[PDB]
């Protein structure tokens, strides 16, 4: 049992593929193999990602698995959606209901707008990024009307590398006519260490200011920097270190060869990498669900040209996409469950704050409950006040 | 498959349009297979080459016309056919003149149902009372809220 | 150390007690805000140094 399948990972995604192989190793069985087709594209050129996509059907493939990025993702979702083709992806979420899409990662916008709440912000600057869509950002701007909020959003995305320090002098410049204390960085874990960094160089890391670093992997970046400086950190993690699961995980992925294995000898793991180690394990589960359930799928490698007018959809698609989406396994990610449409339901992320000690989880998100903060109080605060006695005399 | 069908058959170039979802695409293929492509709909937010543009930049329009009636505080109806452009403009340049801009995405509005949406939406815009509006929508998303 | 209590920040004034002020990486406390002060004993600024 050959099972072909298509896998997009952008240059650069070593420890992501990495956590691709172990994935395709822990989940090997005699009853079916997987039969990855790696193709390194640039995810952001629309034009590359096509041909990558078309190569891959072609070839003729059962499902695909990588990334898209904000501008070539409204290809894949096209293509999948018209060629009945399921796609598997990391990435972030996507904007709506496109079928024939699985997503592993989780919807970040209601457990923000929980945490925001939490702190009771009122006001507060909002740096973001356009590279996942600015989803997060109509979302709390949705619900400063609401709220009542004053957010300060500021595209520190657009900002050219090649002299990018009299424009972070001039960003800190705007958010202290309004003496911003109350930072939200909605970047990837690259273009926060870039802030954080800068943050620090100019000193608003002291107590007084407070930051949420808005991103699944909270441990993923550089938080020693920041540590000891004063101010509080706040952040999520999707990875939690705590599951005897992921425990178990890191115990053999620490010890990995670096030199096989790219970035994978660490004691942690991006959000991304982990997501994609996750994603195996659906695509497993999906099509053993298939031969137990007696539906027969299998073709050749003479799918034709994805261009062919006009374009009929293999019917065999529709049963993979009711496999994927029917799948429901415990990963690092958490409880991994799916609705109709592909994205993910009945999850868990953590809410973490930067201590002195380093991180620690002070409760948790469900789509069901909201926030829920666990033990942690450090109860009490000297509440041992003064018994003053005295009597009754007018 | 428009444009690979309309390269086989060997033009010299394509006019036509696009949305702010196959926006991409066009500016991508165009730009390797060097096939020049005359649009009237929203300019590309940014420099794609083989790409000519009938329609002029209102961002800039915009922001003078608000300094003109001196606005400082306002909300901001938008809708995202056009790609959030003007959207950060207006937000950007919120920062540097010091607005209190009140954006809401009028566009993912439900069409079968929408008028406890509107209710919704003029009762956030009554918590600052507010009584200046931006409309960017497209010609018929106009009316709608005019209506 | 300073830099990471933070203690770099205006209302800080250190004085590098050596003739070599600029011999020393300062790019670091130079935008905290903390006032630095020292002594140079090469001028670079002499035809004869530069
Ligand atoms: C929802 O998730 C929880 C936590 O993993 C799990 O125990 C439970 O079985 C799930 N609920 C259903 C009905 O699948």
Redesign the pocket.
């Given at each position: 049992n050959s099972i072909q399948i298509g896998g997009l990972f952008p240059r650069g995604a070593d420890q992501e593929y990495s956590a691709f192989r172990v994935g395709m190793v822990q989940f090997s069985t005699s009853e079916f193999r997987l039969t990855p087709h790696i193709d390194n594209l640039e995810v952001a050129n629309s034009f590359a990602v096509t041909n990558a996509f078309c190569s891959q059907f072609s070839r003729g493939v059962y499902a695909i698995f990588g990334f898209y990025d904000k501008k070539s993702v409204n290809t894949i979702t096209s293509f999948c959606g018209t060629l009945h083709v399921s796609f598997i992806t990391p990435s972030f979420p996507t904007d709506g209901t496109h079928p024939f899409v699985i997503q592993m990662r989780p919807d970040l916008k209601g457990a923000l707008l929980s945490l925001i709440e939490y702190y009771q912000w009122d006001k507060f600057a909002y740096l973001y990024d356009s590279d996942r869509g600015l989803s997060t950002l109509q979302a709390v701007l949705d619900s400063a009307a609401e709220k009542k909020w004053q957010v300060t959003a500021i595209n520190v995305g657009n900002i050219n590398n090649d002299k990018k320090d009299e424009t972070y002098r001039s960003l800190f410049q705007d958010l202290e006519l309004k003496k911003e204390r109350r930072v939200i960085l909605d970047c990837e874990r690259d273009k926060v260490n870039d802030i954080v960094d800068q943050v620090i160089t100019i000193g608003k890391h002291v107590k007084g200011y407070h930051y949420i670093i808005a991103n699944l992997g909270f441990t993923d970046g550089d938080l020693l920097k920041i540590q000891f400086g004063g101010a509080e950190v706040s952040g999520f993690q999707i990875v939690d270190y705590d599951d005897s699961l992921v425990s178990k995980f890191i115990e053999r992925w620490s010890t990995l060869e670096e030199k096989e294995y790219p970035g994978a000898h660490t004691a942690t793991i991006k959000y991304t990498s982990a997501l994609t180690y996750d994603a195996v394990q659906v695509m497993t589960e999906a099509f053993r669900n298939l031969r137990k359930q007696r539906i027969e799928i299998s073709r050749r490698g003479n799918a034709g040209d994805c261009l062919a007018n006009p374009a009929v959809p293999w019917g065999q698609g529709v049963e993979i996409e009711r496999a994927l989406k029917q799948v429901?396994v415990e990963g690092l990610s958490?409880?991994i469950?799916f609705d109709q449409n592909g994205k993910r339901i009945?999850y868990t992320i953590n809410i973490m704050e930067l201590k002195t000690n380093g991180p620690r989880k002070i409760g948790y998100w469900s789509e069901v409950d909201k926030m829920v903060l666990t033990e942690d109080d450090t109860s009490g605060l000297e509440q041992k006040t003064v018994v003053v006695t005295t009597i009754l005399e007018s």
């Open positions: 429901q958490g409880n469950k009945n």
